[PDB]
């Protein structure tokens, strides 16, 4: 793994003024009044890592227009492979400068630059993280209003991010080109008791051709792989649906039927046809399942205001199911301003007026 957020510090970003908070494992619910800056927090992370948020197209739109000192500063600290990283950005409205900086933290007060300039920082962060911005918001960073994005994604995108979450695509990329080089040197050595040295050198080569085959015909093991993982995920999702809906709702994956297929009492129902509440309940189970199966790979799970459309009896039902996440030393954050959903959890980060209160 073991991607894991540590510290977030924010100044004058969107609706946030000054916030400095530390991420515990288990569940925190982030609460406060509308426009308090709850979502701003979640966006700050997205922005820290990738240099964009959900809500505006231009960096400088993110500057807190209600601060006289028109400079946003984001400091984000995470972890991955026993290593600590820290990212620093500043956005200045007047200047229209975007500054970004990535460095490792170490043996003590120690800092090892990896990138300045926001293009390089994005580059290196994807590298570090292994996943793309797109797979990040569809999996464990579920942005407000977009709870159902994965659920209604094209099968292409679905598999393309199962792979991304589960592969170690860089370990893979070094492998594929270590093979070419291993086979070419061997081919070279062949094009030049001698039959015995040749036997071994050719024996060794044809394995390598095999290993190459069952590994980069893609449409073979890759598909096989994603299927088996989706199976593990949908297995859990179906279980959660059985709890939450008395077995009324079911879900499956079929690349030819367009992706995730929902059935109500055996009957196919397009996601757009569900009640708002049902869509939420299904997206949440799916996401929650993904995060379980992705334990080890990903150590964080955020839901940004995804509980509103739930009715009182689904709210409890769903809180109850989400506590079963408390088992995985994941950092888990739910943003909500709802009493009935928050009563269920113990630890609260309250924000009002762009600060912690």
């Amino acid at each position: 793994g073991h991607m894991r957020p540590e510290r977030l510090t924010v100044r004058n970003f969107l609706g946030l003024k000054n916030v400095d908070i530390e991420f515990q494992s288990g569940i925190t619910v982030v609460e406060g009044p509308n426009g308090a800056g709850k979502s701003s927090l979640f966006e700050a992370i997205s922005f820290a890592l990738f240099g964009n948020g959900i809500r505006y197209p231009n960096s400088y739109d993110y500057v807190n227009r209600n601060a006289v000192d028109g400079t946003a500063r984001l400091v984000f600290q995470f972890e991955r492979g026993g290593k600590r990283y820290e990212i620093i950005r500043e956005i200045n409205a007047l200047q229209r400068k975007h500054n970004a900086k990535l460095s490792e933290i170490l043996e003590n007060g120690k800092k090892a630059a990896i990138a300045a300039k926001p293009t390089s920082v994005k580059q290196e962060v994807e590298k570090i993280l292994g996943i793309e911005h797109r797979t990040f918001i569809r999996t464990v960073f579920l942005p407000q209003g977009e709870i159902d994005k994965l659920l209604i994604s094209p099968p292409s995108e679905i598999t393309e991010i199962i792979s991304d979450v589960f592969q170690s695509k860089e370990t893979l990329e070094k492998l594929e080109k270590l093979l070419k080089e291993k086979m070419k040197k061997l081919e070279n050595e062949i094009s030049s008791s001698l039959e015995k040295k040749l036997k071994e050198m050719s024996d060794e080569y044809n394995n390598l051709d095999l290993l190459r085959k069952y590994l980069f015909d893609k449409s073979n093991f890759s598909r096989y792989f994603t299927g088996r993982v989706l199976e593990a995920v949908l297995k859990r999702t179906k279980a959660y649906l059985d709890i939450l809906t008395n077995g009324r709702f079911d879900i499956d994956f079929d690349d030819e039927k367009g992706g995730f297929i929902i059935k109500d009492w055996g009957i196919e129902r397009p996601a757009r046809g569900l009640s708002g509440g049902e869509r939420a309940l299904i997206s949440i189970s799916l996401a929650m399942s993904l995060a379980e199966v992705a334990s080890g790979r990903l150590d964080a799970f955020f839901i940004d205001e995804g509980f509103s459309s739930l009715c009182t009896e689904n709210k409890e039902k769903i809180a109850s199911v989400l506590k079963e996440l408390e088992r995985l030393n994941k950092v888990i954050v739910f943003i909500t301003c709802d009493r009935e959903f928050s009563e269920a959890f113990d630890r609260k980060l309250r924000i009002t007026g762009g600060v912690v209160v």
Binding site: Q167, N207, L211, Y214, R248, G266, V293, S295, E343
Partner: protein
């Protein structure tokens, strides 16, 4: 001494809310009424209520509260009552409980581990040793540790009794059928004359020494409770003698589950004949349906719930323990999964893996 022990009322509950709402009030008030009348008949000396008298921890009906307070008032008229709130009782009840015990000697609430001495109708001296429900919240360890200390102290305090000592607990004991602290029955100090429990809906005699009872709920709350017994308990206690008790049956509406694999014209027949003159409520669980049941449920009033038999293969994975969990996910690695793909489709060569192994050992040095 003569005691009425009742618990787990759940005033304010309506069942199958999602599905087909049934407000249980009418049934429940009939049960309560019959239990109260019986208390008057026996002219008991003491009334013990061991929690979950209300259904909602957070948003309690004004009708529920009204009902509860009225029942408390009726009960007080016949004998002093002692109340131990449960985990589902409204958070504010304790506050009112506290307020009101400093005001009448006919009602007393206990909300800590702190023992209190009360006097029954004919002046019997009673020491109440309370064990409230244990907040969820190694750490478990320290909490069980803390909870033993509290049980130790109740024992000490039971020894200083005058006439009677009674344990009042609200929790689950070991041996039935999630994230609760389960408490072994052996931990309940034997020197008490009676151990009144609540929280569990089926009447259950936990142990004879000390006499430990859950009286159970007064209504069948959901279909798991189709067979068990519903009522309160009458208990007589005498200094010299062993304790005697007697269930007081609530006679609640029956519940019933119909099991079918295929919903054909035949199942369609049974279902109708089953619900026909049933004073109770019915659930059907099924395997295969053609859309009959949702339509059916609509038109049969006492058919309140339908439900797909959950696959065993689906039941497991949520039980499945951190032992099984780590194996499962680690069996999901891109390479250890790649194992069986090979062992399946070219079977014979596993040096290929030894080939692969060093190959991956190689790159991880770059």
């Amino acid at each position: 001494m003569k005691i009425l022990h009742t618990s787990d009322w759940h005033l304010g509950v309506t069942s199958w809310t999602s599905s087909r709402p049934v407000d249980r009030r009418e049934e429940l008030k009939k049960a309560l009424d019959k239990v109260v009348e019986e208390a008057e008949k026996r002219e008991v000396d003491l009334i013990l209520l061991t929690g979950d008298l209300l259904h909602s921890r957070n948003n309690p009906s004004v009708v529920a509260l009204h009902d509860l307070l009225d029942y408390l008032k009726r009960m007080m008229r016949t004998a002093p009552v002692v109340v131990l709130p449960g985990n589902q009782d409204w958070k504010g009840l304790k506050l009112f409980g506290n307020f009101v015990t400093s005001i009448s000697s006919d009602i007393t609430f206990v909300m800590s581990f702190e023992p209190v001495d009360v006097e029954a109708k004919r002046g019997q001296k009673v020491r109440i040793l309370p064990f409230p429900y244990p907040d969820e919240s190694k750490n478990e360890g320290d909490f069980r540790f803390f909870l033993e200390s509290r049980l130790n102290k109740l024992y000490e305090e039971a020894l200083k009794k005058e006439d009677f000592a009674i344990f009042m607990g609200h929790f689950t004991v070991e041996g039935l059928a999630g994230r609760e602290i389960i408490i072994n029955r052996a931990l309940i100090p034997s020197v008490v004359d009676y151990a009144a429990l609540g929280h569990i809906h089926s009447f259950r005699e936990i142990q004879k020494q000390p006499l430990t009872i859950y009286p159970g709920s007064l209504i069948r709350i959901d279909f798991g409770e189709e067979a068990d017994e519903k009522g309160a308990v009458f208990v007589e206690l005498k200094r010299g003698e062993p304790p005697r008790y007697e269930r007081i049956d609530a006679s609640p509406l029956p519940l019933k589950t119909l099991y079918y694999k295929k919903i054909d014209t035949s199942a369609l027949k049974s279902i109708r004949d089953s619900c026909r003159n049933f004073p109770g409520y019915v659930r059907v669980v099924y395997e295969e349906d053609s859309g009959i049941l949702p339509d059916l449920m609509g038109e049969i009033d006492n058919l309140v719930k339908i439900e797909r038999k959950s696959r065993r293969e689906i039941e497991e994975v949520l039980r499945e323990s951190p032992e099984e969990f780590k194996e499962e996910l680690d069996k999901l690695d891109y390479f250890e999964l790649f194992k069986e793909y090979l062992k399946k489709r070219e079977e014979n060569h596993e040096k290929l893996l030894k080939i692969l192994d060093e190959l991956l050992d190689e790159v991880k040095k770059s």
